[PDB]
From Swiss-Prot, chain A:
It comes from Homo sapiens (Human). Belongs to the dynein heavy chain family. Homodimer. The cytoplasmic dynein 1 complex consists of two catalytic heavy chains (HCs) and a number of non-catalytic subunits presented by intermediate chains (ICs), light intermediate chains (LICs) and light chains (LCs); the composition seems to vary in respect to the IC, LIC and LC composition. The heavy chain homodimer serves as a scaffold for the probable homodimeric assembly of the respective non-catalytic subunits. The ICs and LICs bind directly to the HC dimer and dynein LCs assemble on the IC dimer. Interacts with DYNC1LI1; DYNC1LI1 and DYNC1LI2 bind mutually exclusive to DYNC1H1. The chain holds residues 3082 to 3217 of 4646 of the full protein. It is linked to Charcot-Marie-Tooth disease, axonal, type 2O: An axonal form of Charcot-Marie-Tooth disease, a disorder of the peripheral nervous system, characterized by progressive weakness and atrophy, initially of the peroneal muscles and later of the distal muscles of the arms. Charcot-Marie-Tooth disease is classified in two main groups on the basis of electrophysiologic properties and histopathology: primary peripheral demyelinating neuropathies (designated CMT1 when they are dominantly inherited) and primary peripheral axonal neuropathies (CMT2). Cortical dysplasia, complex, with other brain malformations 13: An autosomal dominant disorder characterized by global developmental delay with impaired intellectual development. Some patients show signs of peripheral neuropathy, such as abnormal gait and hyporeflexia. CDCBM13 is associated with variable neuronal migration defects resulting in cortical malformations. Cytoplasmic dynein 1 acts as a motor for the intracellular retrograde motility of vesicles and organelles along microtubules. Dynein has ATPase activity; the force-producing power stroke is thought to occur on release of ADP. Plays a role in mitotic spindle assembly and metaphase plate congression. Dynein heavy chains probably consist of an N-terminal stem (which binds cargo and interacts with other dynein components), and the head or motor domain. The motor contains six tandemly-linked AAA domains in the head, which form a ring. A stalk-like structure (formed by two of the coiled coil domains) protrudes between AAA 4 and AAA 5 and terminates in a microtubule-binding site. A seventh domain may also contribute to this ring; it is not clear whether the N-terminus or the C-terminus forms this extra domain. The gene is DYNC1H1. This is Cytoplasmic dynein 1 heavy chain 1. It is found in: Cytoplasm, Cytoskeleton.
């Protein structure tokens, strides 16, 4: 409607840019433990042009991978619409859900691995005790 | 669209005339009268009223030459844009006093960005608009020194200080981070991160809310964050939010009733209203 | 971190896409994490990483088909943030999702009925699951629960629907379900749901046919591949469980030498089991190569199967009487694999494959042509001929010749049509 598009002030609030996606990725993945001192720095993979360090670290590389997979879904929809069609649009809410799934499943798997390792340690200590017992 | 041709049986009685958009001379006269009325608040800039209009008229002109409805449906321009321009400058100049021409053109450029630049889609059009703003400001006012147009931030906010003053980008970023902190605590538990353009649009929404204007139209993909930012800015400026929860058996008289509820609650009672609704709330052209 | 990212991207993004598109998306993501040196476990399988055996067995007992697509979709319905929107031509998904939520009294409704609101809030109060069909005519008052808006005031969560205010009861889940595969949802609804696609395609049917062949013809390849899938999660959980049994037994016995015989049998069984697992680990990539070789051997048959079935569905274009379902082709395929007189005593695997291919073509044509007009018999025969030509090796594709034969005879070359010899006539010329 030209009358409505003319009668007020119009603001183009487009889809989140790459920098916005990258900042969301950092802030929503801050609480998880992604520090890998022994991360061998690779080369290439330009997705976001303003990497905070020129050599990326583990956390920044993973957030870069998240923004890459979002861009990959965008490209997949573009290609699928080009060849035939039948495509549903992807919104930043999908990115938020992706990050939420990543965080929750990461905490779940890390916690179960710590539980298994702690059970392993308890078993080791108990078996050391029973070895002492059989020696006695 | 939504318009139906009149029957020839009835057109025979009624004469019709075409009132096109006012020409450059007519726009110049009308908005020069508005400017001359406006700048009498501060007598120090009365002599820069006619050229100020000329610059706005020229900017409107090449904004209309390009940006046709073929490029984008929302790319429409009317003297309504100019009246909002004048009203915004007047609202900004209302508290300002003994203002030199520096501030006059600073707010003029700010309003130019906030009317002819934020509605754009691609970056090239945005930079073309900014270049034209700078070029027109230099063309009509070449005695002014170049400290106002090259200011890239060029952002305003009443939040800091007491009246509408230019603010610093990072000094405003920290402030709005603190306010959004306090916000997510009160309603909207889901964390909100503050990046660059989200700061831009919250500033634009605040600017449109402060003026005695009627409506904000937000265009963008779903889930990007228009509604949450509108609610957040309404939270800052103390605007109550009324959301209409439509359904399948929703009818037009319900829209009439909650419309009149909004009008009474906004006019009979002085408390300000930010009435928010989406496409799902609209069903028919009524 | 890498495998977690891959799994999250799969369960959050890779919905509504057929198996080949999900696989390509996963391959692209894994290739990027390889470029980023992000340590993700190689050749990881998402079917059992996100789910151990128990709930797979429960889903199978809950009327769910054994497809990899259906397994991944059951994963998606199991772990979700946005409420799912199930797309399914058949009724298998709805039956599965009702049988899964029978204990928590899931209810049936749709958008069209006038009582949708009533049981909507009725399920909202008691935390009752709610499946609702016919998503095509979307209902807007479902918006504030899809957004999961929570007005928690006074130490208790609340929700607003229309002019009503309602108490949002925990353990409440809604599953949107549709029937028509070809529908275009608006972006506002698309953003609020995690799309789950059950539509069968060439990719999905190819996967089912290949899996069924590997189960029937070569059960040893099937057991080796199954062992490969269990190697990542299932064997380790069994190992931990029987380790816990060992620890409990040691505690109850307190390490008596008199009971050392019973305990040493358990530890020797433990050592044998561990040796078996390590032998599987040390022979893993050999097994992968062998399974890859067998899958490449049986690949053309599955492609032929998918092509034949989608040819059967396309037969409805000629005549309204040629409606065929996936169950018809599955019955044909089961008859060819098992009830085959030609496989009474054949033992050579390549010979068995060739006989299955030939008899599949024969039986499919025979069953379809029995209920098909006589003037159309040669058409479907030519279609199966094209399918074999695409599936056979050592022959050119004959794309240009077939294109001319089909539609290249309608091309503009009327200029220079010489009468030539008296035998040739104008249309012949
Ligand atoms: N800047 C942001 N940072 C984090 N999350 C955001 C931001 N903007 C929007 N969201 C998310 O979007 C959701 C609501 O989106 P909404 O405003 O309904 O989108 P739309 O206006 O397209 O309907 C919220 O749950 C919120 O988490």
């Amino acid at each position: 409607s030209p009358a409505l598009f003319n009668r007020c002030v119009l603001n183009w609030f487009g889809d989140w840019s790459t920098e916005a996606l990258y900042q969301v990725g950092k802030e929503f993945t801050s609480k998880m433990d992604l520090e890998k001192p022994n991360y061998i720095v690779p080369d290439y993979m330009p997705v976001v042009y303003d990497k905070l360090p020129q050599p990326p670290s583990h956390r920044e590389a993973i957030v870069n991978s998240c923004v890459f997979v979002h861009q990959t879904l965008h490209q997949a929809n573009a290609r699928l619409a080009k060849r035939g069609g039948r495509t549903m649009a992807i919104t930043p809410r999908h990115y938020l859900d992706f990050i939420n799934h990543y965080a929750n499943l990461f905490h779940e798997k890390r916690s179960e691995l710590e539980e298994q390792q702690m059970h392993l340690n308890v078993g080791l200590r108990k078996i050391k005790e029973t070895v002492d017992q059989v020696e006695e | 669209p939504g318009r139906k041709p009149l029957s020839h049986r009835f057109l025979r009685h009624v004469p019709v005339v075409y009132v096109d958009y006012p020409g450059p001379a007519s726009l110049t006269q009308i908005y020069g009268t508005f400017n001359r009325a406006m700048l009498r608040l501060i007598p120090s800039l009365r002599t820069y009223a006619e050229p100020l209009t000329a610059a706005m008229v020229e900017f409107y002109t090449m904004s209309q030459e390009r940006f046709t409805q073929d490029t984008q449906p929302h790319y429409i321009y009317s003297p309504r844009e100019m009246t909002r321009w004048v009203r915004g400058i007047f609202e900004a100049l209302r508290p300002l006093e003994t203002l030199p021409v520096e501030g006059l053109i600073r707010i003029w450029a700010h309003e130019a960005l906030r009317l002819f630049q934020d509605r754009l889609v691609e970056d090239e059009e945005r930079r073309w608009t900014d270049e034209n703003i700078d070029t027109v400001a230099l063309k009509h006012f070449p005695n002014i020194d170049r400290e106002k147009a090259m200011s890239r931030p060029i952002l305003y906010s009443n939040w800091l200080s007491k009246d509408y003053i230019p603010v610093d980008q990072e000094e405003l970023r920290d402030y709005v981070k603190a306010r959004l902190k306090v916000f997510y605590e009160e309603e909207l538990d889901v964390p909100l991160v503050l990046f660059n353009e989200v700061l831009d649009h919250v500033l634009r929404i605040d600017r449109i809310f402060r003026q005695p204007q009627g409506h904000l139209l937000l265009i963008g993909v779903s889930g990007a964050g228009k509604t949450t930012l509108s609610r957040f800015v309404a939270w800052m400026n103390g605007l109550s939010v009324y959301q209409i929860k439509v359904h399948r058996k929703y009818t037009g008289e319900d829209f009439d009733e909650d419309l009149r509820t909004v009008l009474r609650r906004s006019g009979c009672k002085n408390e300000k209203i930010a009435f928010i609704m989406d496409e799902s709330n609209v069903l028919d052209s009524g | 971190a890498g495998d977690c990212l891959l799994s999250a991207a799969f369960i959050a993004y890779a919905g509504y896409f057929d198996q080949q598109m999900r696989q390509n998306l996963f391959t692209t993501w894994s290739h990027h994490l390889q470029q980023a040196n992000i340590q993700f476990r190689t050749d990881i399988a998402r079917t059992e990483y996100l789910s151990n055996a128990d709930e797979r067995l429960r889903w199978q007992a809950s009327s769910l088909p054994a497809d990899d697509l259906c397994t991944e979709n059951a994963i998606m319905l199991k772990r979700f943030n946005r409420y799912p929107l199930i797309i399914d031509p058949s009724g298998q998904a709805t039956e599965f999702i009702m049988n899964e939520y029978k204990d928590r009294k899931i209810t049936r409704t749709s958008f069209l009925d006038d009582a949708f609101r009533k049981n909507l809030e009725s399920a909202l109060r008691f935390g009752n699951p709610l499946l609702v069909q016919d998503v095509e005519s979307y209902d807007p008052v479902l918006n504030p629960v899809l957004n999961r808006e929570v007005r928690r005031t006074g130490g208790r969560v609340l929700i607003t629907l229309g002019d009503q205010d309602i108490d949002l009861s925990p353990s409440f889940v809604i599953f949107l379900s549709t029937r028509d595969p070809t529908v275009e949802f608006p972006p506002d609804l698309c953003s609020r749901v995690t799309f789950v696609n059950f539509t069968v395609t060439r990719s999905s049917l190819q996967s089912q046919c290949l899996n069924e062949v590997l189960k029937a013809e070569r059960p040893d390849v099937d057991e080796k591949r199954s062992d490969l899938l269990k190697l990542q999660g299932e064997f380790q959980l069994r190992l931990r469980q029987l380790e816990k049994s060992l620890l409990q037994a040691l505690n109850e016995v307190k390490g008596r030498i008199l009971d050392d015989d019973t305990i040493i049998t358990t530890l020797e069984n433990l050592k044998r089991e561990a040796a078996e697992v390590t032998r599987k680990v040390e022979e893993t990539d050999i097994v992968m190569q062998e399974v890859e070789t067998v899958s490449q051997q049986y690949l053309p048959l599955s492609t032929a199967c998918s092509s034949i079935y989608f040819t059967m569905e396309s037969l409805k274009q000629i005549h309204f009487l040629y409606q065929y379902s996936l169950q018809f082709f599955l019955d044909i395929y089961h008859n060819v694999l098992y009830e085959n007189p030609n496989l009474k005593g054949v033992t050579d695997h390549t010979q068995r494959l060739s006989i299955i291919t030939k008899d599949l073509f024969q039986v499919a044509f025979n069953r379809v042509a029995r209920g098909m007009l006589h003037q159309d018999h040669i058409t479907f025969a030519m279609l199966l001929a094209r399918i074999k030509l695409k599936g056979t090796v050592g022959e050119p594709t004959y794309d240009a010749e077939f294109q001319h034969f089909l539609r290249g005879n309608e091309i503009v070359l009327s200029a220079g049509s010489t009468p030539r010899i008296q035998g040739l006539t104008v249309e012949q010329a």
